[PDB]
GROMACS .gro file of C-alpha atoms in nm:
model
  330
    1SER     CA    1   2.271   0.515   3.651
    2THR     CA    2   1.936   0.650   3.531
    3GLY     CA    3   1.794   0.977   3.408
    4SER     CA    4   1.445   1.120   3.379
    5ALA     CA    5   1.325   1.443   3.217
    6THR     CA    6   0.989   1.599   3.141
    7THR     CA    7   0.904   1.657   2.774
    8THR     CA    8   0.655   1.929   2.683
    9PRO     CA    9   0.458   2.002   2.363
   10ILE     CA   10   0.586   2.313   2.189
   11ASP     CA   11   0.238   2.445   2.106
   12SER     CA   12  -0.135   2.376   2.141
   13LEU     CA   13  -0.127   2.121   1.858
   14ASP     CA   14   0.153   1.899   1.990
   15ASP     CA   15   0.359   1.987   1.680
   16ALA     CA   16   0.675   1.869   1.861
   17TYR     CA   17   0.807   1.808   2.211
   18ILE     CA   18   1.099   1.980   2.382
   19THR     CA   19   1.307   1.844   2.674
   20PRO     CA   20   1.564   2.051   2.869
   21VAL     CA   21   1.928   1.941   2.830
   22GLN     CA   22   2.228   2.075   3.025
   23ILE     CA   23   2.539   2.133   2.810
   24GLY     CA   24   2.880   2.248   2.927
   25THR     CA   25   3.035   2.386   3.246
   26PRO     CA   26   2.876   2.583   3.396
   27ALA     CA   27   2.558   2.431   3.255
   28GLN     CA   28   2.383   2.589   2.958
   29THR     CA   29   2.026   2.462   2.941
   30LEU     CA   30   1.877   2.423   2.590
   31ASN     CA   31   1.536   2.279   2.508
   32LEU     CA   32   1.601   2.007   2.251
   33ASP     CA   33   1.376   1.798   2.028
   34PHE     CA   34   1.448   1.433   2.122
   35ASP     CA   35   1.437   1.255   1.787
   36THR     CA   36   1.437   0.877   1.759
   37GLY     CA   37   1.450   0.931   1.379
   38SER     CA   38   1.799   1.085   1.359
   39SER     CA   39   2.138   1.051   1.528
   40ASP     CA   40   2.288   1.398   1.564
   41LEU     CA   41   2.287   1.614   1.875
   42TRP     CA   42   2.299   1.962   1.727
   43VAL     CA   43   2.230   2.304   1.875
   44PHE     CA   44   2.177   2.667   1.794
   45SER     CA   45   2.498   2.835   1.899
   46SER     CA   46   2.706   3.150   1.925
   47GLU     CA   47   2.836   3.044   1.580
   48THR     CA   48   2.493   3.044   1.412
   49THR     CA   49   2.449   3.310   1.144
   50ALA     CA   50   2.284   3.594   1.333
   51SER     CA   51   1.997   3.644   1.090
   52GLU     CA   52   1.907   3.276   1.136
   53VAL     CA   53   1.859   3.306   1.512
   54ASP     CA   54   1.517   3.433   1.618
   55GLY     CA   55   1.446   3.366   1.983
   56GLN     CA   56   1.623   3.036   2.039
   57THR     CA   57   1.858   2.979   2.327
   58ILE     CA   58   2.215   2.936   2.204
   59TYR     CA   59   2.506   2.723   2.320
   60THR     CA   60   2.827   2.928   2.356
   61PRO     CA   61   3.119   2.681   2.360
   62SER     CA   62   3.369   2.955   2.449
   63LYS     CA   63   3.190   2.991   2.786
   64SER     CA   64   3.216   2.617   2.866
   65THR     CA   65   3.536   2.518   3.047
   66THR     CA   66   3.482   2.154   2.937
   67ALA     CA   67   3.419   2.225   2.567
   68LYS     CA   68   3.686   2.112   2.321
   69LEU     CA   69   3.676   2.173   1.948
   70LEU     CA   70   3.678   1.843   1.758
   71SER     CA   71   3.950   1.923   1.510
   72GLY     CA   72   3.847   1.909   1.147
   73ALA     CA   73   3.498   1.774   1.218
   74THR     CA   74   3.191   1.911   1.045
   75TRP     CA   75   2.830   1.799   1.013
   76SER     CA   76   2.541   1.859   0.777
   77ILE     CA   77   2.196   1.705   0.801
   78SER     CA   78   1.881   1.719   0.589
   79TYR     CA   79   1.553   1.600   0.736
   80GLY     CA   80   1.258   1.432   0.565
   81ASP     CA   81   1.053   1.749   0.626
   82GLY     CA   82   1.287   1.948   0.402
   83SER     CA   83   1.467   2.127   0.685
   84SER     CA   84   1.847   2.126   0.731
   85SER     CA   85   2.140   2.250   0.940
   86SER     CA   86   2.519   2.231   0.943
   87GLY     CA   87   2.824   2.341   1.139
   88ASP     CA   88   3.127   2.228   1.340
   89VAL     CA   89   3.166   2.000   1.642
   90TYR     CA   90   3.270   2.027   2.008
   91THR     CA   91   3.291   1.760   2.272
   92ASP     CA   92   3.139   1.865   2.603
   93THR     CA   93   2.950   1.738   2.905
   94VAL     CA   94   2.580   1.673   2.839
   95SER     CA   95   2.323   1.582   3.104
   96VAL     CA   96   1.959   1.483   3.076
   97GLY     CA   97   1.759   1.484   3.395
   98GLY     CA   98   2.040   1.366   3.617
   99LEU     CA   99   2.221   1.139   3.365
  100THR     CA  100   2.563   1.270   3.254
  101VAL     CA  101   2.783   1.190   2.952
  102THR     CA  102   3.128   1.348   2.933
  103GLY     CA  103   3.283   1.379   2.591
  104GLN     CA  104   2.951   1.390   2.406
  105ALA     CA  105   2.973   1.531   2.051
  106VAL     CA  106   2.777   1.859   2.050
  107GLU     CA  107   2.723   1.972   1.691
  108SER     CA  108   2.722   2.351   1.686
  109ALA     CA  109   2.517   2.502   1.402
  110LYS     CA  110   2.668   2.761   1.171
  111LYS     CA  111   2.362   2.750   0.941
  112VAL     CA  112   2.000   2.642   0.993
  113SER     CA  113   1.720   2.636   0.736
  114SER     CA  114   1.423   2.873   0.762
  115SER     CA  115   1.188   2.636   0.943
  116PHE     CA  116   1.430   2.612   1.234
  117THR     CA  117   1.473   2.988   1.254
  118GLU     CA  118   1.093   3.030   1.239
  119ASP     CA  119   1.044   2.801   1.540
  120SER     CA  120   1.168   2.987   1.847
  121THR     CA  121   1.083   2.696   2.084
  122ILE     CA  122   1.334   2.435   1.954
  123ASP     CA  123   1.700   2.500   2.040
  124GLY     CA  124   1.822   2.196   1.853
  125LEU     CA  125   1.782   1.820   1.825
  126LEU     CA  126   1.900   1.527   2.037
  127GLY     CA  127   1.916   1.223   1.810
  128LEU     CA  128   1.819   0.882   1.949
  129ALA     CA  129   1.834   0.663   1.637
  130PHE     CA  130   2.134   0.438   1.572
  131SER     CA  131   2.478   0.599   1.563
  132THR     CA  132   2.534   0.466   1.211
  133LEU     CA  133   2.323   0.763   1.088
  134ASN     CA  134   2.535   1.028   1.256
  135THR     CA  135   2.651   1.283   1.001
  136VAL     CA  136   2.980   1.403   1.155
  137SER     CA  137   3.268   1.382   0.907
  138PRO     CA  138   3.533   1.260   0.875
  139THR     CA  139   3.488   1.069   1.207
  140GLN     CA  140   3.129   0.963   1.283
  141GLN     CA  141   3.018   1.036   1.641
  142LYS     CA  142   2.798   0.847   1.888
  143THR     CA  143   2.455   0.944   2.018
  144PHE     CA  144   2.388   1.040   2.377
  145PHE     CA  145   2.212   0.711   2.439
  146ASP     CA  146   2.495   0.518   2.277
  147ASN     CA  147   2.746   0.694   2.502
  148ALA     CA  148   2.535   0.644   2.816
  149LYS     CA  149   2.428   0.283   2.752
  150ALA     CA  150   2.703   0.102   2.935
  151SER     CA  151   2.648   0.301   3.255
  152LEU     CA  152   2.270   0.268   3.262
  153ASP     CA  153   2.102   0.022   3.496
  154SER     CA  154   1.934  -0.128   3.183
  155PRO     CA  155   2.029  -0.035   2.823
  156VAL     CA  156   1.693   0.122   2.744
  157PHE     CA  157   1.514   0.454   2.719
  158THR     CA  158   1.139   0.514   2.721
  159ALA     CA  159   0.917   0.772   2.555
  160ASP     CA  160   0.589   0.868   2.730
  161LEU     CA  161   0.459   1.164   2.530
  162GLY     CA  162   0.148   1.349   2.644
  163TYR     CA  163  -0.155   1.457   2.445
  164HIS     CA  164  -0.181   1.833   2.510
  165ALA     CA  165   0.016   1.776   2.829
  166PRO     CA  166   0.371   1.707   2.955
  167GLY     CA  167   0.526   1.362   2.936
  168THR     CA  168   0.852   1.190   3.023
  169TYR     CA  169   1.173   1.051   2.870
  170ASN     CA  170   1.341   0.800   3.102
  171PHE     CA  171   1.686   0.652   3.054
  172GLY     CA  172   1.799   0.328   3.211
  173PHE     CA  173   1.473   0.205   3.367
  174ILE     CA  174   1.114   0.112   3.294
  175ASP     CA  175   0.857   0.290   3.514
  176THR     CA  176   0.606   0.008   3.565
  177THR     CA  177   0.352   0.263   3.698
  178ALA     CA  178   0.346   0.459   3.367
  179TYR     CA  179   0.140   0.212   3.159
  180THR     CA  180  -0.151  -0.028   3.193
  181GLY     CA  181  -0.145  -0.398   3.110
  182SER     CA  182   0.177  -0.544   2.971
  183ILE     CA  183   0.450  -0.425   2.734
  184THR     CA  184   0.457  -0.615   2.406
  185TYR     CA  185   0.799  -0.627   2.247
  186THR     CA  186   0.853  -0.655   1.874
  187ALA     CA  187   1.153  -0.707   1.647
  188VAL     CA  188   1.364  -0.419   1.515
  189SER     CA  189   1.574  -0.393   1.201
  190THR     CA  190   1.866  -0.151   1.238
  191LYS     CA  191   1.979  -0.188   0.876
  192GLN     CA  192   1.857   0.161   0.786
  193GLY     CA  193   1.972   0.310   1.116
  194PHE     CA  194   1.617   0.355   1.248
  195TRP     CA  195   1.396   0.191   1.510
  196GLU     CA  196   1.225   0.004   1.227
  197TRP     CA  197   0.956  -0.253   1.308
  198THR     CA  198   0.647  -0.420   1.158
  199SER     CA  199   0.298  -0.345   1.284
  200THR     CA  200   0.056  -0.635   1.250
  201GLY     CA  201  -0.238  -0.428   1.120
  202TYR     CA  202  -0.496  -0.165   1.195
  203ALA     CA  203  -0.857  -0.084   1.268
  204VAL     CA  204  -1.061   0.235   1.214
  205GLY     CA  205  -1.289   0.331   1.500
  206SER     CA  206  -1.494   0.030   1.609
  207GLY     CA  207  -1.431  -0.142   1.276
  208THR     CA  208  -1.289  -0.481   1.190
  209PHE     CA  209  -0.916  -0.519   1.254
  210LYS     CA  210  -0.724  -0.579   0.932
  211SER     CA  211  -0.421  -0.807   0.969
  212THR     CA  212  -0.154  -0.668   0.739
  213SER     CA  213   0.217  -0.611   0.789
  214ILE     CA  214   0.309  -0.241   0.801
  215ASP     CA  215   0.682  -0.174   0.812
  216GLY     CA  216   0.771   0.161   0.959
  217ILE     CA  217   0.985   0.357   1.206
  218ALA     CA  218   0.915   0.474   1.559
  219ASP     CA  219   1.004   0.844   1.516
  220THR     CA  220   0.953   1.087   1.802
  221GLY     CA  221   1.083   1.367   1.575
  222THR     CA  222   0.795   1.341   1.328
  223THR     CA  223   0.461   1.495   1.430
  224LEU     CA  224   0.217   1.282   1.235
  225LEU     CA  225   0.136   0.918   1.153
  226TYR     CA  226   0.234   0.836   0.790
  227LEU     CA  227   0.089   0.508   0.660
  228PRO     CA  228   0.018   0.343   0.324
  229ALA     CA  229  -0.239   0.511   0.103
  230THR     CA  230  -0.484   0.219   0.134
  231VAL     CA  231  -0.486   0.247   0.513
  232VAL     CA  232  -0.514   0.627   0.513
  233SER     CA  233  -0.800   0.621   0.263
  234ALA     CA  234  -0.984   0.366   0.480
  235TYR     CA  235  -0.946   0.596   0.785
  236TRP     CA  236  -1.060   0.920   0.616
  237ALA     CA  237  -1.351   0.747   0.438
  238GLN     CA  238  -1.508   0.726   0.783
  239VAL     CA  239  -1.506   1.107   0.826
  240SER     CA  240  -1.786   1.287   0.644
  241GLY     CA  241  -1.641   1.554   0.417
  242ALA     CA  242  -1.278   1.452   0.448
  243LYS     CA  243  -1.073   1.448   0.132
  244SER     CA  244  -0.718   1.462   0.008
  245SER     CA  245  -0.617   1.816  -0.095
  246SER     CA  246  -0.333   1.860  -0.341
  247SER     CA  247  -0.292   2.229  -0.258
  248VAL     CA  248  -0.283   2.169   0.117
  249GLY     CA  249  -0.073   1.855   0.069
  250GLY     CA  250  -0.283   1.588   0.235
  251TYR     CA  251  -0.614   1.495   0.390
  252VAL     CA  252  -0.825   1.775   0.537
  253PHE     CA  253  -1.161   1.744   0.707
  254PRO     CA  254  -1.434   1.975   0.843
  255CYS     CA  255  -1.330   2.120   1.176
  256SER     CA  256  -1.681   2.036   1.304
  257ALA     CA  257  -1.618   1.661   1.260
  258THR     CA  258  -1.573   1.419   1.549
  259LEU     CA  259  -1.291   1.189   1.445
  260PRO     CA  260  -1.283   0.810   1.488
  261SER     CA  261  -1.001   0.644   1.673
  262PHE     CA  262  -0.724   0.452   1.497
  263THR     CA  263  -0.584   0.120   1.625
  264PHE     CA  264  -0.247  -0.026   1.530
  265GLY     CA  265  -0.120  -0.377   1.610
  266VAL     CA  266   0.197  -0.464   1.797
  267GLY     CA  267   0.211  -0.841   1.780
  268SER     CA  268  -0.124  -0.954   1.917
  269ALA     CA  269  -0.151  -0.633   2.121
  270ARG     CA  270  -0.339  -0.322   2.014
  271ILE     CA  271  -0.267   0.049   2.063
  272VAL     CA  272  -0.570   0.279   2.028
  273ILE     CA  273  -0.513   0.637   1.917
  274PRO     CA  274  -0.815   0.847   2.025
  275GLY     CA  275  -0.979   1.042   1.748
  276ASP     CA  276  -0.893   1.377   1.905
  277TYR     CA  277  -0.521   1.298   1.864
  278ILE     CA  278  -0.575   1.304   1.486
  279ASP     CA  279  -0.702   1.665   1.473
  280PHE     CA  280  -0.432   1.920   1.380
  281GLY     CA  281  -0.653   2.221   1.354
  282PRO     CA  282  -0.734   2.476   1.087
  283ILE     CA  283  -0.530   2.458   0.768
  284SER     CA  284  -0.480   2.837   0.796
  285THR     CA  285  -0.580   3.086   1.063
  286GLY     CA  286  -0.960   3.118   1.078
  287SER     CA  287  -1.036   2.834   0.834
  288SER     CA  288  -1.309   2.579   0.899
  289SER     CA  289  -1.105   2.314   0.716
  290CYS     CA  290  -0.873   2.119   0.949
  291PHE     CA  291  -0.552   1.921   0.884
  292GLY     CA  292  -0.548   1.543   0.941
  293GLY     CA  293  -0.301   1.371   1.167
  294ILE     CA  294  -0.292   1.052   0.962
  295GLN     CA  295  -0.137   1.106   0.620
  296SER     CA  296  -0.015   0.897   0.328
  297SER     CA  297   0.345   0.779   0.328
  298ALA     CA  298   0.328   0.725  -0.050
  299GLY     CA  299   0.576   0.993  -0.138
  300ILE     CA  300   0.812   0.911   0.155
  301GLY     CA  301   0.936   0.560   0.091
  302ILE     CA  302   0.877   0.449   0.451
  303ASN     CA  303   0.591   0.447   0.699
  304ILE     CA  304   0.642   0.669   1.004
  305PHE     CA  305   0.488   0.604   1.346
  306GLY     CA  306   0.533   0.962   1.461
  307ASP     CA  307   0.404   1.150   1.763
  308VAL     CA  308   0.035   1.093   1.681
  309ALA     CA  309   0.093   0.716   1.723
  310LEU     CA  310   0.363   0.712   1.989
  311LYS     CA  311   0.183   0.948   2.229
  312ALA     CA  312  -0.096   0.690   2.256
  313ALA     CA  313   0.156   0.442   2.406
  314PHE     CA  314   0.434   0.396   2.654
  315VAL     CA  315   0.722   0.311   2.422
  316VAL     CA  316   1.037   0.119   2.520
  317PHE     CA  317   1.345   0.166   2.303
  318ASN     CA  318   1.543  -0.141   2.409
  319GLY     CA  319   1.911  -0.107   2.318
  320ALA     CA  320   2.013  -0.458   2.417
  321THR     CA  321   2.258  -0.655   2.207
  322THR     CA  322   1.968  -0.723   1.970
  323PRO     CA  323   1.750  -0.408   1.998
  324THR     CA  324   1.374  -0.438   2.024
  325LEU     CA  325   1.079  -0.203   2.068
  326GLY     CA  326   0.814  -0.230   2.337
  327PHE     CA  327   0.463  -0.078   2.335
  328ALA     CA  328   0.206  -0.062   2.612
  329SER     CA  329  -0.124   0.112   2.645
  330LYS     CA  330  -0.146   0.388   2.903
   0.00000   0.00000   0.00000
């Protein structure tokens, strides 16, 4: 089997991407944030505290003839961005773009933190990291990809995110028309539950490529590119007027700047992020100071190749017996 669905930026800045997911019988379509950095499929629901729902589409398990309460199971997740959610658990039928899993754990929110309520475009998250990170207790549950793997033509899914434009998540096949050149595969450590790999270095604009190992995660659920402070300082030093702002919480730069590109290594291959992908717009409405898309990972504990990086590439999440990650230019 295979599946294919279109993923669309939630706003004009590409702050996140949503992909429609069919849940239950008859189908309830929710637009979920496909997150290779977490392992829970959780949704706004008829159980969510009413004051915490503000425009999202909800899953109503009582209207699904295939939904079954998973007795005694609860979940609670806290994300690196400070957001959180929690609730109970159903099993139900879940389909993405033609690909169907029966018995998928659907984590129904009872509580969401304010940032989720404040974002009316995200109805929940579909985790695509390793099932070892799933938060359901007392019996951990499997991701959608983990449940679908055995049935897929190949045990893979691909992320092709657009810059200011729609893109595609494919399950079970590699679309050889979606990228240029070849796909370079690189090793993955699953010990932390993430798609964790080691970039071979970086360049800023037309500058000299610096060979240096950068360990980090391929995370479709994080907007920006978080890298070591030495690398981020080298990038922003090339932008006249850029500086790190403690009040804003990272590097800002004059909105009139033209940004240089940023290149990261995958083995001997190179992925080039165009400068425009690094512009996240005014820090506040009407400001002429703009927020940078490359930020220090220093307070995080891990480097994060988020959407800024991944949308420059066609990315293969290879779930073979020994998982690997593939990157191609596009």
